[PDB]
């Protein structure tokens, strides 16, 4: 979950390579997208659209082993000065477009980095962020210019818990090498279902690979295939994804002056061509 | 009179006579501008390039902050650097289009092959400008790009490591590399491109444009 | 339209024409028509476009260099995509280096190879033109390839 | 890959607009 990133990685979600710590547990890789305007004027509310697409009619393995759907979650890193727009500065349609999202800053005094999720994966295939741009005029620590935006989005259950132990949403493997003999499910009424798989011979050996219930099985009886043999099949159907983009915190004066200059240029060009046209006449009156 | 003053001594009229003796034939279309547009992009690089030497600091501790300083504090610095970033790409692009126009008009064939060669050299020089420039900000991309390109020559069996060690000024990438690269970007390449542009232009002005199609 | 025909009664011009020159002795006068009135338009046009691009799409400032952290998604500039695609795909490094060096060196040989033919118009030389278009296609192909992951870099995620 | 499309279509397309325009002026003056 997005908060386990805070728990396990307090200072920042992004690693110096730009990998986003989210990947340390969500080991699958599904696409993710972040869309924002190419430019924004200072002190302006705008839309930042996260996209976390996946086959809607495709379910995953639940913690107990059932077949439940999947939720989406994401971390979004915006430039310094950017933050969620005050509820009062958000218009109606946008406010409606955003939904019941609970934008959560990564830590105290880091309102530009925002965690999101878990949200329902069917309704939030895309997640709208209502963002207010900063103002270099009132904040002298902010400047106009081009800045990066980093998305880290995810859908589906992770494979590793903060404690370290694995989960029931990934493949399991053998220990060493020896004859398997058992396929049972020594389930308690206190705990849930398991699956027994033994080992023997070659060098004594009497070890058992008791694994959780949830994945499939492609192993029947009596084998010994090294250590790392895929015997459980991969039940994962989600995955983490990153996308980066750029936004220009633009100054309108900067633009309008440019426009003026361009107009001047076009004027000058025109006059030069006209002059040439004037000369074309004078030259034509001296041919023969 | 000034014209008489100059004409008495340097025969200034000799110039004007030469400029006005030149004509442009009918087969010279708009694509014949691409060469002169590649040049126009370079002059911009020279101006904006020069300007940034007044604030940029070629040290691993000073560079990144100096680029920031140009972007955030220096007047119009953002515009200068932006122009310098764009006009470089544009120079390379216009050079490629220039090459297209040259090849697809057969202007490289005899007796203009030296112009073509000097052109190729010019292209290698411009790409060198690009590569060396790319790493001056000494940000992540620049550093890791330099670290990749610097290692390529090592593949040569006899003198690869020497070449690489010359390029980075050592066995690894660091301050020496930045120094050598900055020297290369702000001293060597300008003089080289100058010389080869001079030769290019002299040969072209000597022989004139290639014929029609 | 302001036009001077070639003076074919002048041996000096014919001597140049025979040599593949003298093509700046006829046509419209270079000065003032082109140099004084049209070149400035091109200059100002270029500068104007670059300025507009610079204002609307200014330069960014990446994160500072970390020699202990190799970035994911690390590319050069576009004009090095084709070369970059070659160097990372070809297993033998020296081969790749040679292939890289083959680009400018090969180009230097073009004029001497095609001196066989005197023609300039691409239509009067379809072999060279075919090879050129092929080259261009392969170049752009490699270029795009450079952006895709190494798995689907050559196949380009198609075949 | 949206800015790229715009850039491509427009950079390729507006050339013909400028061209046609130039021709139009040429026709207007009568060369």
């Amino acid at each position: 979950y997005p908060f386990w990133a805070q728990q396990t990685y307090p200072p920042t979600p992004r690693e110096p390579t730009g990998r986003i710590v989210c990947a340390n547990c969500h080991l699958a890789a599904k696409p993710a997208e972040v869309e924002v305007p190419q430019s924004v004027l200072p002190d302006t509310v705008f839309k930042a659209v996260v996209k976390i697409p996946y086959d809607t009619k495709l379910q995953q393995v639940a913690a107990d082993g059932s077949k439940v759907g999947l939720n989406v979650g994401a971390v979004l890193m915006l430039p310094e000065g950017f933050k969620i727009a005050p509820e009062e500065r958000i218009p109606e349609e946008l406010k409606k477009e955003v939904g019941d999202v609970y934008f959560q800053p990564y830590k105290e005094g880091q309102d530009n980095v925002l965690l999101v999720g878990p949200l329902p994966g069917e309704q939030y295939q895309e997640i709208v962020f209502p963002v207010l741009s900063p103002n270099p005029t009132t904040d002298k620590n902010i400047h106009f210019g081009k800045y990066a935006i980093h998305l880290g989005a995810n859908r589906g259950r992770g494979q590793i818990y903060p404690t370290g132990e694995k989960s029931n949403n990934n493949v399991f493997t053998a220990s060493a090498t020896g004859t398997i003999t058992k396929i049972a499910k020594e389930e308690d009424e206190y705990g849930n279902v398991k699956y027994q798989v033994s080992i023997q011979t070659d060098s004594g050996k009497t070890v058992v690979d008791t694994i959780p219930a949830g994945p499939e099985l492609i192993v029947s009886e009596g084998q010994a295939v090294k250590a790392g043999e895929a015997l459980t099949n991969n039940p994962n159907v989600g995955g983490f994804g990153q996308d980066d983009t750029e936004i220009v915190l633009q100054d309108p004066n900067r633009v309008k002056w440019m426009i003026a200059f361009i107009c001047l240029v076009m004027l000058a060009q025109l006059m030069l061509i006209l002059k040439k046209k004037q000369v074309e006449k004078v030259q034509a009156a001296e041919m023969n | 009179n000034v014209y008489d003053w100059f004409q008495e001594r340097l025969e200034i009229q000799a110039l004007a006579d030469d400029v006005t003796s030149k004509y442009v034939p009918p087969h010279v279309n708009i694509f014949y501008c691409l060469g002169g547009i590649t040049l126009t992009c370079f002059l911009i690089q020279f101006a904006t390039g020069f300007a940034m030497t007044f604030y940029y600091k070629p040290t691993v501790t000073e560079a990144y902050a100096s680029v920031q300083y140009i972007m955030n504090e220096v007047s119009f610095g953002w515009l200068i650097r932006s122009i310098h970033r764009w006009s470089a790409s544009m120079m390379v692009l216009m050079m490629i289009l220039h090459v297209f126009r040259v090849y697809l008009t057969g202007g490289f064939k005899k007796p203009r092959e030296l112009t073509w060669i000097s052109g190729v050299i010019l292209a290698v020089i411009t790409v060198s400008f690009g590569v060396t420039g790319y790493s001056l900000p000494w940000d992540q991309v620049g550093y890791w790009a330099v670290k990749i390109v610097s290692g390529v020559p090592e593949a040569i069996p006899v003198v690869g490591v020497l070449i690489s060690d010359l390029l980075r000024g050592g066995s690894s990438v660091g301050q020496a590399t930045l120094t050598r690269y900055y020297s290369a970007h702000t001293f060597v390449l300008p003089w080289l491109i100058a010389v080869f542009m001079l030769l290019h232009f002299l040969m072209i002005r000597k022989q004139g444009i290639s014929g029609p199609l | 339209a302001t036009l001077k025909k070639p003076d074919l009664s002048d041996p000096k011009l014919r001597a140049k024409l025979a040599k593949g020159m003298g093509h700046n002795y006829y046509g419209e006068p270079a000065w003032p028509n082109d140099l004084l009135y049209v070149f400035p338009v091109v200059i100002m046009g270029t500068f104007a476009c670059i300025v507009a691009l610079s204002v609307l799409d200014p330069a960014m400032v990446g994160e500072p260099a970390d020699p202990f952290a190799t970035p994911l998604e690390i590319l050069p500039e576009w004009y090095l995509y084709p070369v970059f695609q070659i160097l990372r795909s070809v297993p033998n490094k020296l081969l790749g280096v040679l292939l890289m060096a083959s680009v400018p060196l090969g180009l230097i040989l073009v004029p001497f190879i095609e001196n066989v033919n005197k023609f300039q118009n691409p239509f009067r030389r379809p072999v060279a033109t075919t090879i050129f278009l092929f080259g261009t296609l392969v170049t752009i192909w490699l270029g795009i390839g450079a952006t895709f992951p190494l798995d689907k870099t050559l196949t380009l995620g198609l075949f | 890959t949206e800015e790229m499309l715009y850039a491509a279509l427009l950079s390729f397309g507006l050339i013909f607009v400028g061209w046609g325009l130039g021709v139009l002026l040429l026709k207007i003056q009568g060369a």
Partner: peptide, 28 residues
């Protein structure tokens, strides 16, 4: 929406340059 006008400007100079170059030299 001054930004839109901003881009339009770029487009218009790009167009107008070709236009003026063409008209200038009876272009091609």
């Amino acid at each position: 929406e001054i930004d839109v006008l901003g881009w339009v400007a770029l487009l218009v100079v790009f167009t107008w340059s070709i236009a003026m170059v063409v008209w200038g030299r009876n272009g091609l």
